């Protein structure tokens, strides 16, 4: 399909994974200095 979707919802769901992404990325950069 290519209309029944909702980009405004897909992205809105992405910004979510971004929340924890800070932890994951934080652990990466945090371990780098480890």
Automatic annotation (TrEMBL):
This is PlnF. It comes from Lactiplantibacillus plantarum. The lineage of its organism: Bacteria, Bacillati, Bacillota, Bacilli, Lactobacillales. The chain holds residues 19 to 52 of 52 of the full protein.
